[PDB]
Ligand binder design. Sequence first.
Ligand SMILES: C[S@@+](CC[C@H](N)C(=O)[O-])C[C@H]1O[C@@H](n2cnc3c(N)ncnc32)[C@H](O)[C@@H]1O
Lengths: 58, 198, 426, 65
Amino acid sequence: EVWALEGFGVAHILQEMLTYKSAPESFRLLVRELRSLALELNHFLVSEKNFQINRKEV
Amino acid sequence: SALERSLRLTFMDELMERARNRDPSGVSEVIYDMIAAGLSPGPRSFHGLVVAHALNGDEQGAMHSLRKELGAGQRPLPETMIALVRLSGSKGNAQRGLELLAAMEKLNYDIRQAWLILVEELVRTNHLEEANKVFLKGARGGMRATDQLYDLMIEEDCKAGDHSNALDISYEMEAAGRFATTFHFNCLLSVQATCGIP
Amino acid sequence: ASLETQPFPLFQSPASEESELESADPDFYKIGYVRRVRAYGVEFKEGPDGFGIYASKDIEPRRRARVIMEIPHELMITIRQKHPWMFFPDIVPIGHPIFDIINSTDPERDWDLRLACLLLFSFDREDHFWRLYGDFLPAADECSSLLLATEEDLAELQDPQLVSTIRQQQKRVLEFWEKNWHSGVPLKIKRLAEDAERFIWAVSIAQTRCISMKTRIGALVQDLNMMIPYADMLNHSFEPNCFLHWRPKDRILEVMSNAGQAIKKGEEMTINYMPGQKNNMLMERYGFSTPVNPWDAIPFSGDSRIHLNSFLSVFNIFGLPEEYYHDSESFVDGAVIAAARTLPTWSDIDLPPIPSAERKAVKELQDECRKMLAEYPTTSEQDQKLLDSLSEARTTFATAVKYRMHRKMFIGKIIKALDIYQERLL
Amino acid sequence: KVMTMDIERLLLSEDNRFEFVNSVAAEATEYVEKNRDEYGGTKKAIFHVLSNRVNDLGFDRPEAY
Ligand SMILES: C[S@@+](CC[C@H](N)C(=O)[O-])C[C@H]1O[C@@H](n2cnc3c(N)ncnc32)[C@H](O)[C@@H]1O
């Protein structure tokens, strides 16, 4: 169904179905378990305006 | 008829002569003389007074002459507003620029040329940060700058490294239908290359 | 009604000889409506000056531009603007002699000859829409384009450079016809234009009705010169209420009423054929002139000059020189905007105009304009008389008279503008 | 019933279906920001955007048809 929804490009429904209908807390779980394996899954986003490397809340 | 016309003629000629000589005290003399002649309304006369102040940079005197002509007169002719906005942008005073440009809304005059002048003079006066403020707030207001002004402002921003505004102006330029050329992307890349994040 | 032949525009309206906008023959719209043309809120009306589009209802303002017409691509004719000639209705069979003739045109000088070849072939191609539409094109005696004029008219044109350019155009067209309709051509070419008059007519129509646009045909972004059978009925204006636009998904030419503009029942729907061309260019190509032409020019050589910014403000003209417009804030019109673009003028950062020396300059330029008027043998209103009553409505001659009259009327408006500018400078 | 033809008309009007739908979402969220009437009963902001846009196309449809 994810493959079908993203085939339609209807990606805001896909976002709804995969996040707030139940970073997302399950990605928090993913990063926390890898961080528990002693791997830093580190999420950054780069300001287009300022090139500042904003670390995401993870 | 011809009496009033010749009085108007000679009085406004000696006023304009004082104004070109940047003598606003003289212009005030001729205002008083025309009031004594009963020629009380006259937009050209207060335009002469404002340009007499502006040519010597008397921002306060220019605003005083504006307050005179609005408070005890009639709507100013466009060159009055344009000249006082130019005196702002050439002096700095960008807040006064925006305040008067917003006050131009109430005359129904074309704001485009005055805003272009304000931006251009601010850039020429190296008042780039507030020039960016007035430009972006105009573009978000849906006004289109002249192409020369986009090109100059982008180039000067990128020389200043102000990509935070250069990219935004480039988006507004695209939204205005001026497609970004290799020059504009070269200007953006000149600053982007500095970030160390290729 | 997907058949029939010979529908025509009732000639009751072109009967002005004894001395105004009746509806066009309903079949004129029907032949389009049966072929997915749609007119929204507009009506074809038939004056002695031919067809026009007029709003049949008050149209409220809208936030986006509002559609007023849809013409489907299948009814159009197109030539590629650039060398590799292709036809997107693709009327012309592969290897038809028409392709050899059309190739023998200059890539950029003879686009009108190419369009004329297509127009004639589309009158020969049965059950092409223009087989029916050609009856509504102006015949050789009622077309305004000066390619149908002769020296009897051009003597009345009194504009030797434009006379020379019209003569060169006619020479070029007739030389092309003589070269490519010689007796050796197939019947399927000789029947297109068996005489010079048919070809010069076709070229005059191609010139007066050629729209050109950048368009997208599927994937291909391309430059086309094209004929659109209901957008070519729009009349010119330099203050147009409409513009043409292209939809590539369904290949529709929209005619769009401008965003934020209200329009009134009986208002003429007009477009800006070519923006920024002097009246002599509109005579050269289209075959008409307009007195409010805001790009017209005057051969001034005076060292007298007027304060441009004060000339603007006294007439409340606004915008940059490419942009000059007038607002509600009443004789000010396109001719005064042309004046601001044309008068010998000076400007300075803030310096005021000399109230005396500007009157001196006004007097000098007014006497220059007066001697320019004096270079014609007659005043404007003599041509107005020669148009409110006229011997035979000879369309090319009446067009030349309209040209001369417009120019004089213009210079008159220049005089009046300088007078009112001086008076209103107080 | 008919409203999807208007949708198709607007889909035919706009040069990118995804950009059109983005513009509709933008128009609806700015509508529900510039006006704070609840406007959530039998008529919906999406249908309102489609109605206003087809009215710009000149077509006689009422708000939310
Ligand atoms: C695009 S063609 C339209 C054909 C025209 N409606 C007819 O009856 O054949 C433009 C023609 O309309 C006329 N025309 C164009 N602009 C005009 C104007 N501003 N005022 C009056 N007539 C105009 C001229 O005769 C010109 O040849």
